[PDB]
Structure to design on (257 residues):
């Protein structure tokens, strides 16, 4: 199957998923000088007060916290979005070293990791149908740099030993994703894609300018996860990021400056 290795990583994905070479692939480098300040963009409304986390799993690519998105709870709106997008899950991408790991880059700078909070447009009824639409998903991306710990991340870090290998899952209730957000909601936005197969061009990307800081111990715990299932040769889950893709005919818009 697809993965992040020499023989099945990003440079191979186009063979099963030809949209890999499409016109709106993600991630991209955000060239801050070239991004257009758009005074008509709205502040982003992030309304996470009633979020209900359910489960955390290791899917062999990342780990993901899934939410109960069966009611209009945790929702994203405003910004570049028309309508209401409901939070369904978050997951991360990270590196083998603190100098790489993010998917998006800023002026070619790579962060240690990137958090993706995945939301689907309610007009499409469910996440699966939304992923078939050009405005189906909105992913809020947040960079992680290594420095002081993020207290709101610790609950996640501490359960990872229970989901070490592909296929493992656990109950994971009462997790508040507000504890993963930076102070500022200033952002860049552009039309793009899923960053893993099937690479659907269904995402409005909203990438926050302000990174969150996590400690070296917290990110070390991410790197202790495994790509492999229990019983198979151990391959640490690190460098699960797709590199920047061609911007092609897109403009990245800034909510600030
Ligand atoms: N990294 S990303 O945020 O772009 C992203 C998603 F948010 C995403 F939802 C999918 S998915 O394929 O729709 C199922 C989730 O594992 C993805 F495949 C995917 F790549
Ligand atoms: Zn992602």
């Amino acid at each position: 199957h697809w993965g992040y290795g020499k023989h099945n990583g990003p440079e191979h994905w186009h063979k099963d998923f030809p949209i890999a070479k499409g016109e709106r692939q993600s991630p991209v480098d955000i060239d801050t000088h070239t991004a257009k300040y758009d005074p008509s963009l709205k502040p982003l409304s992030v309304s996470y007060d009633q979020a209900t986390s359910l489960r955390i799993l290791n899917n062999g690519h990342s780990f993901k916290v899934e939410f109960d998105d069966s009611q209009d709870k945790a929702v994203l709106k405003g910004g570049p979005l028309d309508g209401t997008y409901r939070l369904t899950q978050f997951h991360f991408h990270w590196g083998s070293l603190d100098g790489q790991g993010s998917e998006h880059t800023v002026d070619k700078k790579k962060y240690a990791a990137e958090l993706h909070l995945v939301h689907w447009n309610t007009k499409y009824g469910d996440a699966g149908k939304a992923s078939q639409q050009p405005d189906g998903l909105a992913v809020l991306g947040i960079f992680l740099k290594v420095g002081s710990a993020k207290p709101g991340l610790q609950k996640v870090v501490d359960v990872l030993d229970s989901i070490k290998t592909k296929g493992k899952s656990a109950d994971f209730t009462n997790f508040d994703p507000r504890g993963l957000l930076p102070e500022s909601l200033d952002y860049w936005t552009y039309p793009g894609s899923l960053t893993t197969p099937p690479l659907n061009e269904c995402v409005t990307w909203i990438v926050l300018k302000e990174p969150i800081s996590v400690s070296s111990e917290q990110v070390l715990k991410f790197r202790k996860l495994n790509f492999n299932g229990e019983g198979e040769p151990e391959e640490l889950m690190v460098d699960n990021w797709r590199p920047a893709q061609p911007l092609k005919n897109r403009q990245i818009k800034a909510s600030f400056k």
